[PDB]
Amino acid sequence: ITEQTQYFFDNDSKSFSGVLDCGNCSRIFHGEKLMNTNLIFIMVESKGTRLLIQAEQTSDGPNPCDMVKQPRYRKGPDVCFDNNVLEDYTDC
Amino acid sequence: SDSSKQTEAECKGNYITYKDGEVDHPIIQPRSWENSKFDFDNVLAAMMALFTVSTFEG
Amino acid sequence: TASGVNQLVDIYEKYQDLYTVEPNNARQLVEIAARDIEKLLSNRSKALVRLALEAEKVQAAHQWREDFASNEVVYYNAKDQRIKPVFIEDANFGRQISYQHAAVHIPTDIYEGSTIVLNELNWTSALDEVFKKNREEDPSLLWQVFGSATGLARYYPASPWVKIDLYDVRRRPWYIQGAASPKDMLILVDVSGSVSGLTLKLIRTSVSEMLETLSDDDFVNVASFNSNAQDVSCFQHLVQANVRNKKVLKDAVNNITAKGITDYKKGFSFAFEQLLNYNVSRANCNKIIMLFTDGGEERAQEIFNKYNKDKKVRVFTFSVGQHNYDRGPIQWMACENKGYYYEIPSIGAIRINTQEYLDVLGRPMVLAGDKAKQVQWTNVYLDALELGLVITGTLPVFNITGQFENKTNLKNQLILGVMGVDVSLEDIKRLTPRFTLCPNGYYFAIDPNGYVLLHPNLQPKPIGVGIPTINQEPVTLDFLDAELENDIKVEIRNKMIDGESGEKTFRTLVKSQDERYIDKGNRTYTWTPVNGTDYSLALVLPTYSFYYIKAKLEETITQARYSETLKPDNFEESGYTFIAPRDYCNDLKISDNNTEFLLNFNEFIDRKNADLINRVLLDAGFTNELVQNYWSKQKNIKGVKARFVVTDGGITRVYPKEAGENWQENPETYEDSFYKRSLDNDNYVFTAPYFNKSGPGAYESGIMVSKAVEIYIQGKLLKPAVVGIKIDVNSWIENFTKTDCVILDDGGFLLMANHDDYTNQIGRFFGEIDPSLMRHLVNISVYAFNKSYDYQSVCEP
Ligand SMILES: *[C@@H]1O[C@H](CO)[C@@H](O)[C@H](O)[C@H]1NC(C)=O
Ligand SMILES: *[C@@H]1O[C@H](CO)[C@@H](O)[C@H](O)[C@H]1NC(C)=O
Ligand SMILES: *[C@@H]1O[C@H](CO)[C@@H](O)[C@H](O)[C@H]1NC(C)=O
Ligand SMILES: *[C@@H]1O[C@H](CO)[C@@H](O)[C@H](O)[C@H]1NC(C)=O
Ligand SMILES: *[C@@H]1O[C@H](CO)[C@@H](O)[C@H](O)[C@H]1NC(C)=O
Ligand SMILES: *[C@@H]1O[C@H](CO)[C@@H](O)[C@H](O)[C@H]1NC(C)=O
Ligand SMILES: *[C@@H]1O[C@H](CO)[C@@H](O)[C@H](O)[C@H]1NC(C)=O
Ligand SMILES: *[C@@H]1O[C@H](CO)[C@@H](O)[C@H](O)[C@H]1NC(C)=O
Ligand SMILES: *[C@@H]1O[C@H](CO)[C@@H](O)[C@H](O)[C@H]1NC(C)=O
């Protein structure tokens, strides 16, 4: 079971800016989306931790111990021929 | 040879035996209605069979 | 300017003729597809019905010979008086076929010439006539199997069996489907001090095998009593015995230990308590409690009188292992209740015993005259004969010996066996033509359980469970796990399962074909139930795919110039050209090399589904017109490494004729990630090439761009084709440098970064470069993510 991940733009706003506080340091970034095109332009400051991996990596599926509490809707068959009086119980 | 067939008529053909008891790695093998090494079929066969017992071997 | 979207718009518009935009009503299409699939399933049901009638009637008069040394039965044993068959390399099934007799497959651990087996061979030998009757009255029927309840398997198209043969029809899912109705299992593993050693190994192996003999529509749980009835797993109730839950139960069973003192009374009380948890969505029918133990000395009479007074629940009991403990209590416990007592002396006897309780569970349905002869389609599962994905229809054949004599004192309460027919998903897929829809549209249908059937994201390979470990289950993909799941799609799934017919529209996110992008679009769902059986065929159409263009040609002269328009020798002046592997009549179907497919198509058109080929030829003509008019004019623009145009029908054209050698896009247009994505959006889409690919790219291929060619023929939005270009990396590096600057796209893929080292590693997912930048960026309402799951994937460990 691979756990794929994808990223996409959320807000229609174009301009973005702020500060980065990795550690005992500061950085400046300013974002801007190329209008009428699927692109974003950002200007990070020169180098001065934990790698994000968008590549699918092997992982266990959702914990089944938790999904069985609220199972997905299910409509089983409605015949299940059982419990007939004319049955022989002499076999053992 | 297979322990789940208590007669010659049902003891024929191949059967699946598992190496060293592991459920995986089956091995095909034939069925043989083989007699014991020493058996009491005859009086003569019994005498030799009992002789080894007197020797504390087998 | 390079691709010239508006230029193609004008080219399409000026030739208003050759267009007749019929509307995909989205309701009549689903209706007719449902009708056709229902008709196919009913055809298979009729074949099953007649086969079952013939088999029962033949069995009614057998006389039970007992000396077959004379008048030997003649049959073709698959694992090669035997027959010598002459095989025809039939391409329908992908393997050797005979069509002149039904093969047989006696499981390796069953004696070939036993008295009971030979009789089955003899009385089934008359079934080949009806097999041939069915295969002749209508072709395209894959298999007819008679899974007799002795291990035999008489499948009509005789092919050699596909290395130790462990196959056993009595355990296959399509057999258990008809052998007995659903169940409510509860395995009472006896992990007590008396079962330490080999007995515990046998118990664990037998429990795992049993869980392997449970369909995906019956529930199960695994308790254990050692003077205290705990639960080996995390569930504490019945958990549907799914593909996943089976794995959890198997692991929990494997990790158990013998300890303490046995206490049957407390364990059975716990068990009977668990089966009365009616508020957990139980499959409230065929309750069972299958105790495993070495040997008892206390029969829980008081418990069996407190609960189970009316004999509602069945109780099977296994005396696993070799020992000398008393077995009277266990036999009596099985006998009083409507159960049956077994024994598992050692490994090898597990496979033949754990599957026998289905014979007992089938007694009520056998005693039911004809209410039980209902065709019961299974869920998608890989065929045992390497055929693909096949759903098997099943219909039990009962034992009618002495009928109409009213003897009613015989073993007429056990089925002869389940005997099914196979339908291949590749066969259903041709009843739902995808080519009339846009690349985004598709069909899909779901079991009542929700498991998909004929879904585009269902790939023919086993569904994964858990992480692999250092050193046959059906392919069941829940509908929410085959796509991105939200609060809206769940309502659609719930409504389809109930059979309600209705139409819904909304805006949702679609996981692109490359599993590396997500986009927002409208998807007008539509669903309906196929009244013949329990299914819900759906249909997904974006708002822009309501109308489609279909070509009408009668001059036959323009057809010619279109026919030689896509010749291999015109590439030098018309750009390279691909053709999608579509079913243009019986024309050869290509697998890997598109060049020979193009040549075969050229030969076929030279010689002479007519609408589809007409559309392909029209698209070829229009693309040739565009390229020759313009792309032949402004050849080799400064920063345009190559130019490509993709349409529907399968026409993909690349101008330079040299970028084709570096064109990794699949020839089929409906499988091109950028094409579907480019349609999804309404603006130019940039595709970052993969990184660290064994093949070439990212410097000699260039980044890709695309833009759907929107059209208004008569006021209807249409996006038949996409025109794109592969910008050379160096030229636009020069541009960007002329002006730490990073150019990025949704999905965090570095198109460039000013630093030379970064642009050296162009195309790598930005995030392995400056992770903190995005870690903050995701926090400010940009670059969200959806951590979905892909259950069908391959790993190295
Ligand atoms: C199914 O249900 C009813 C038939 O009575 C009708 O509304 C619908 O068109 C039917 N469609 C199919 C495919 O059976
Ligand atoms: C169903 O069987 C009939 C009779 O052979 C045949 O004419 C019809 O085409 C079949 N339907 C399908 C969908 O194959
Ligand atoms: C059973 O065997 C006999 C003798 O070989 C044969 O005549 C008969 O046809 C067989 N039964 C059927 C149904 O063919
Ligand atoms: C096995 O079960 C015991 C029960 O206490 C637990 O301690 C142990 O961690 C389990 N081991 C594995 C590998 O699950
Ligand atoms: C379900 O049944 C169990 C056992 O009787 C009980 O403990 C529990 O409260 C019930 N829950 C609901 C929601 O009915
Ligand atoms: C069918 O039932 C009869 C009842 O006497 C039995 O003799 C026969 O063996 C059964 N069928 C098979 C294949 O055993
Ligand atoms: C590409 O992957 C291989 C995997 O073995 C690795 O050895 C190599 O260093 C990688 N190179 C780049 C540029 O990512
Ligand atoms: C990210 O967002 C979370 C939730 O709003 C917040 O707790 C956290 O401080 C933010 N910053 C980082 C670096 O996670
Ligand atoms: C995907 O992520 C967005 C933003 O975090 C969220 O609104 C949406 O519900 C998510 N959908 C799924 C299927 O994860």
Curated annotation (Swiss-Prot), chain C:
Subcellular location per the Swiss-Prot or TrEMBL entry: Membrane; Cell membrane
Limits of the VWFA domain: 184-361
Glycosylation positions in this chain: 43, 122, 255, 279, 399, 406, 522, 531, 593, 692, 735, 779, 786
Disease note: Developmental and epileptic encephalopathy 110: A form of epileptic encephalopathy, a heterogeneous group of early-onset epilepsies characterized by refractory seizures, neurodevelopmental impairment, and poor prognosis. Development is normal prior to seizure onset, after which cognitive and motor delays become apparent. DEE110 is an autosomal recessive form characterized by profound global developmental delay and hypotonia apparent in infancy followed by onset of seizures in the first months or years of life.
Motif (MIDAS-like motif): 190-194
Domain Cache residue range list: 377-474
Keyword check for Ion transport: yes
Assembly behavior: Dimer formed of alpha-2-1 and delta-1 chains; disulfide-linked. Voltage-dependent calcium channels are multisubunit complexes, consisting of alpha-1 (CACNA1), alpha-2 (CACNA2D), beta (CACNB) and delta (CACNA2D) subunits in a 1:1:1:1 ratio.
Keywords: Calcium, Calcium channel, Calcium transport, Cell membrane, Disease variant, Disulfide bond, Epilepsy, Glycoprotein, Intellectual disability, Ion channel, Ion transport, Membrane, Metal-binding, Phosphoprotein, Signal, Transmembrane, Transmembrane helix, Transport, Voltage-gated channel
Designated name of the protein: Voltage-dependent calcium channel subunit alpha-2/delta-1
Organism: Homo sapiens (Human)
Gene Ontology cellular-component terms listed: extracellular exosome; GABA-ergic synapse; L-type voltage-gated calcium channel complex; neuronal dense core vesicle; plasma membrane; presynaptic active zone membrane; sarcoplasmic reticulum; voltage-gated calcium channel complex
Tissues of expression: Isoform 1 is expressed in skeletal muscle. Isoform 2 is expressed in the central nervous system. Isoform 2, isoform 4 and isoform 5 are expressed in neuroblastoma cells. Isoform 3, isoform 4 and isoform 5 are expressed in the aorta.
Domain comment (free text): The MIDAS-like motif in the VWFA domain binds divalent metal cations and is required to promote trafficking of the alpha-1 (CACNA1) subunit to the plasma membrane by an integrin-like switch.
UniProt similarity note: Belongs to the calcium channel subunit alpha-2/delta family.
PTM annotation, UniProt: Proteolytically processed into subunits alpha-2-1 and delta-1 that are disulfide-linked.
One of the protein's GO biological processes: calcium ion transport
Lineage, opening ranks: Eukaryota, Metazoa, Chordata, Craniata, Vertebrata
Main location per the UniProt record: membrane
Annotated membrane topology: Single-pass type I membrane protein
Extracellular face of the membrane: 1-797
Residues of the full protein shown: 50 to 906 of 1103
Role summary: The alpha-2/delta subunit of voltage-dependent calcium channels regulates calcium current density and activation/inactivation kinetics of the calcium channel. Plays an important role in excitation-contraction coupling.
